[PDB]
Amino acid sequence: STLFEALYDYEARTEDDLSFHKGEKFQILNSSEGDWWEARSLTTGETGYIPSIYLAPV
Secondary structure, three states: OOOEEEOOOEOOOOOOEOOEOOOOEEEEEEOOOOOEEEEEEOOOOOEEEEEHHHEEEO
16 A cells, blocks of 8 residues: 655545645545545544545655
C-alpha cells in the first residue's frame, strides 16, 4: 500500500470529515465507501473522512 498526501487544503463539511492542509500525509484505512476515504492523519493522529480527489500517492 501507499501513504497519500494532500494536494490542497480542505475544510471539513461534515462532522465525520477531517480538515487538512496541503502536504499533510495520510494512512488510508478504508476506500470502499465511495469518494471520501476513511483515513488517519500522520500530523494529528486523528481518524476521519477525506476526499480522495484532494490526495495523491506519496
